[PDB]
Write a protein that binds this ligand. Structure first.
Ligand SMILES: [Ca+2]
Ligand code: NA
Length: 223
């Protein structure tokens, strides 16, 4: 996250870190047994790390739970990143407490200008790279579909939304992918792509989660 701030410890209790020897993507706890993330974060083995703030220190709220099932959206396009969503079933249920909690799937798609919270352990520098120990946060609004399409002519599908700032300076970046965009207590976005990060008129692009409530409930019921 570039241009953000360090989250209060455990104040984003649905944020997970996906770990394969080190942190490589974010995700969101949506059920005691299920995490949603980006299909481009797919690996055949993933350890889900819940209750993190410092991913480099055991602070005593962590639960490390291996993935038992990893299911990418059947229409995920690895090139365009259309349908950039996957579900991870945990090998045992996460215990839900104040530090580890689910986030609601959306009632409706978010209106333009809805304030959201984006989080992750991705790069914090727009010039060079620095990877944080501590979970970073960013307040950012949903952008209109017109603004999103003007930033990326011909590249925005119906499954994509832009969230952030056209002026630059404030965006998700490398290592945030798969993580949450939460607006009024509902998961509206998954960190997906952008043209670099925090550049002028290149806002972050996010998987439009409100398109996938049917697919998620189906997948949970089937597995
Ligand atoms: Ca930790
Ligand atoms: Na981004």
């Amino acid at each position: 996250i570039v241009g953000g701030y360090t989250c209060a410890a455990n104040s984003i209790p649905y944020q997970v870190s996906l770990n394969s020897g080190s942190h490589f993507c974010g995700g969101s706890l949506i059920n005691s047994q299920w995490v949603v993330s980006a299909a481009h974060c797919y690996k055949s083995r993933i350890q889900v790390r819940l209750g993190e703030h410092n991913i480099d220190v055991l602070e005593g709220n962590e639960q490390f739970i291996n993935a038992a099932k990893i299911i990418t959206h059947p229409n995920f396009n690895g090139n365009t990143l259309d349908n950039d969503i996957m579900l991870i079933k945990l090998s045992s249920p996460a215990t839900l407490n104040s530090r580890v909690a689910t986030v609601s799937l959306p009632r409706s798609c978010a209106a333009a200008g809805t304030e959201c919270l984006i989080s992750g352990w991705g790069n914090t520098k727009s010039s060079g790279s620095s990877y944080p120990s501590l979970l970073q946060c960013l307040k950012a609004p949903v952008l209109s579909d017109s603004s999103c399409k003007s930033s990326y002519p011909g590249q925005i599908t119906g499954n994509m939304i832009c969230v952030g700032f056209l002026e630059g300076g404030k965006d998700s970046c490398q290592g945030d992918s798969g993580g949450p965009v939460v607006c009024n207590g509902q998961l509206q976005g998954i960190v997906s792509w952008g043209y670099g990060c925090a550049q002028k008129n290149k806002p972050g692009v996010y998987t439009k989660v409100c398109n996938y409530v049917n697919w998620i409930q189906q997948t949970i019921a089937a597995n």
